[PDB]
Structures are given as structure tokens and as C-alpha cells.
């Protein structure tokens, strides 16, 4: 049955969508004199038994000027695909590093079906634990050949899709006081189109398919990701499911939920944000980019929307630091 | 066994690579005043029985000024993945359309393992046949709501990866006189990192893995794509295999082979080009972008290398038109 679902994933993934009507897009043209920055980067093992690696990024000109904040970036996929080394994600981290003038940490995590959830969440904690280990032992000076000054008091987690779900899980784990990693302080979370689930569909989930994503594909992701016998109302998928933490008692750090207007996951992301808003103590900003689909920030690197996301994440970081 | 190979494909695909040493990349920063263009586009069925669609792109400002040449773009994958609607490929076609001031045709084709090769090649011919049908019946005027002037005497095929292989197959089919579609004239072919194969490895194929591609992944592609019992020396994979056409008797239109210096497929692409060069009547240009891996033109849309590829394809089109 896993092999059946695997074959169906391939079919669904590359199936695409058909535009009912004409559409116009706006494309940026040649830029003769372009502005430049170098970004240094390297891979390191963070979990030796599972052979899990992360990539560290450093903006060179900015690193020599001040102590850098940390952005931990968790890639997307459906808990079933994606590597830090993939051009798509690597490119995004290059941008994050230079734009935010920050040290970026981009870990691999175990993917399903081989490693069903909560494998990724365990791995995400191992990344944060690895960072702690590096912070307290001055392993930072051996990250790159030259020196590197890092401010572990200014850490931020940026989550894309399934990485957005991972971000939420960390926030809860820290917020509840379950895990605690001084001198590492996560000051905020950025949930870019977080991968949340539910047995009951939202209106947007029943709406038209995106360029790549369909409701069937998302359902397939959950079938392969969640433990055998679980439903989409499981707390790992649905943060507001029947048996999920209350969250009204948990102290969460400030959160930024970014989503596209034409996303299937839009309604569920807005439900998420505004349920937290109405709860006391929670600072949650919700930003919706009109007429955009999943991954617009990374799928269209040089678009106006992507640039704006980077600016918003930057301001968010300034406000909290 | 197909289900076994499917599970192994997933693992191999998202496995990634580990950098042995530090690396630097150069990233372009914010562009305050950006130059713009609109591109109109639509989907059409070109093969009703298999429900195969293509996407037509039109640069608006350029279409009102002159008759547009045609670029038929065949997407990559490994004959196993990819849709015209995918952001990755859609973005590239937006660029092609505006940069080259051309009408772009981006078809889906049936993918393996469900449809093993030569399914894609049959579908590629159906696209060209569809274009012929449109040209001779003035169906072009009903492509978009407004008018569209197309020069079917100036058609070019741009192939990416597996699409590069498809391009080669069309070139042979036209060149030999097997198929002929007046008033449609394909004046040249662009083979961007064409997906060619061989039982025997090149030096580059034994070299280090790329960000995404590994030799194992490419081998898996062929196992799922080629008919059951075939080897990588089959003519559909290897154009210079033991039982492949001679090509010295076939009249090929001018060809442009573009490849990255750090690609696994580099050596085989260079063998391809220079074997044709040494044969009389063949005009083949070979361009190698140093220290680049597969898909650099599309994976890094706003990079210097990608811009250069677009310029080179443009000059190629001018020279032949």
C-alpha cells in the first residue's frame, strides 16, 4: 500500500493544472549594472547516527562588521521531499543570508514514508540542540576557516510549508518549557504557508488547484507522513485538532504567518493565525499576498512579492531584536 | 520491481550532496527601479485521447510590433517528472517569451514509468503536428482573444535535459525526411544539457555528485524510462550507440549544445557535439559554462549565467532567421 501510494504520488506530483482562461504575468527584464554580495557556506553533520547534515551560510561583508543573528530555515516538501542542497532551497538561503545580514542554518531532516512524522520534529530539535552545543563550546570559530561572530540571543526560525509546521512544533516545545537551550534564544517564528491539516476541508481547499499543488497531493502527503492509522486531525497535522495542546496556557514567542491569496492552505493558515490572535498574550501578524500560490517567495526569486517577503521578515527581526 | 524502483527514486531524489569544503556564491541584491514586460499565456489540449495540454506564451508589447518566431520548449525531469505548469518551468518560459520576443510553446508529455520511452517522442511529434494544424487552418487567431501574428517559417526547439533528448529525436526525424510539416520550418535546435545515456561511464559521470543529480539517480531514470530489457546503449538513450542511426547521411539543422562545466552529463554532451562537428554538413556550436551544474539557467533565474544563456539563444535565433 505504501508502494501504491508512492506510484500515485509520482502521478499526482507531475500532473499540473489547466488554466480555464487567459492570464497575464509581469516579468522583470535585463539589469545591466547589478548589485552584488558574496555568501560563504559549508555543510556539517549535526546528527551522526542518522547522517543528517545542515548547511551554514555567512554573508561576508556583513560578518566582518557586526555579530550576526541566526535564521534557522526549514525547507518544504510534504515531509516527503527536499534537501538543503537543492538549488531551489540553496538559492533561497543565499537570499536570506545576504538580505537579512544573518547567519542561516539550513538542515536536512528525515522524510516520509521511510521516516513517518514526528521524525522531522525530533530532527528539528536536534538542530537546535546542535546549535546550543556549538554556542557553549565556541565551535562557531571552527565553522569557517576565518572567524565568525554569532549572536545566539537573536535566533529566528523561518519555516516553509512542512517547515512551517516544524516551526510551529518548536514554538510549542519552547513555549511550554519542555525544552530550554540557554544561551540560545528563539525570539520569533516565521510560518510561510505552514503545512497544517484537517479531516474537514476549508473553502480554499475545495477551490481550484494551484500550478503544482492539489488537494489530492496534500492528502497523499498526509497519508505517507502521519503514523499508520492516524487521521488529518492528528495534532502533528492539525494544531487545533480535538486532542491537540490548548496553547492558551502556553507562552508563544511572536509569530509571522505569510501565505498566498490563491493558496489551498490559505484559509487554514488564517484560521491558525486568528485563533492565536484572539488568545491573550499572543502576538501574531498575518500577511496575505493577493493572487499568489504556494512558494511564490522561492519559486519566483526575483519577483516583487519575494522581495517584499524578505523585507517583511527583516523588519520583523529588527522589531524583536 | 517498478514499485521498488519508485521507492528508491524518492530516496535518491531528495538525498542531496555534502560539500567537502567551503564555497562562495555571488548573489544579486535589491533592484529599486526594475524594468518590466507583460506576457500573455493560455493552455490548450493538443492530444485529446491522452489529455495532453500545452501552454502558449505571447509577449504583449512585441506581438503588436511584428510577426513572432516560435520557440517550442521541452521541459526536463528524467522522462519521469515535470509539467509545463510547474513554477520552475513556467518562469523559464516567461523569460524565453519576453527575452527572445517569441511565441513559446511549452507542452506536457507522458512521463515514465507508466509511459516508458518512446512515449515522450511520439508526444513531441504530436505537438509539432498540432502546430502544423494550427498554422494551415489559421487557428492562431483563436489562440488569444485578440490577434496574433506568428512566423511558422521561423521555429526553434529548445530542449532542457530530457527535453534536450527529445529535441535531438525531432532533429533526426525531420533531418532524415521521415516527417515533414510545411509551412512549419524548424531552423535550429538548442540542446541544454541533453539527457543522453551510455552503459560505459564518462569521466564526469564518475566525478562528484551535483546539488541534486547523482549517477545513481540518472541510472534510475533510465531503468524507469527505457522499455523493459533495454540497456543505456539503446538508441533512445545513446545517440551514438551500437545500433543507433548513422547521422552522417542525415541532414541536421544547426544545433546549439549548452552544458555546465560541473555537470555529470558534460563529457557525454561534448562527445555528442564534437562527433557531429567532425561530420561534414553539420553546424554544431558547443558552449560550456564553467563551474555550473544542471539547470543553472532555470534554477538560478536572475543569475549572470542564466542571462547569458538567453542572450546566446537569442543570437543563435537571429543568425538562423
From Swiss-Prot, chains A, B:
One of the record's GO molecular function terms: carboxylesterase activity
Tissue specificity of this protein: Expressed in axillary buds, leaves, stems, hypocotyls, flowers, siliques, and vasculatures of shoots and roots.
BP-aspect Gene Ontology terms: regulation of secondary shoot formation; strigolactone metabolic process
Matches recorded under InterPro entries: AB_hydrolase_3, AB_hydrolase_fold, Carboxylest/Gibb_receptor
Active site per UniProt: 161 (nucleophile), 263, 294
Keyword annotations from UniProtKB, A to Z: Cytoplasm, Hydrolase, Nucleus, Serine esterase
Swiss-Prot/TrEMBL catalytic activity: (-)-2'-epi-GR24 + H2O = (-)-2'-epi-GR24 ABC-rings + 5-hydroxy-3-methylfuran-2(5H)-one; 5-deoxystrigol + H2O = 5-deoxystrigol ABC-rings + 5-hydroxy-3-methylfuran-2(5H)-one; orobanchol + H2O = orobanchol ABC-rings + 5-hydroxy-3-methylfuran-2(5H)-one
Domain of life of the native organism: Eukaryota
UniProt similarity note: Belongs to the 'GDXG' lipolytic enzyme family.
Protein name in UniProt: Strigolactones hydrolase CXE15
Organism of derivation: Arabidopsis thaliana (Mouse-ear cress)
Lineage of the species this protein comes from: Eukaryota, Viridiplantae, Streptophyta, Embryophyta, Tracheophyta
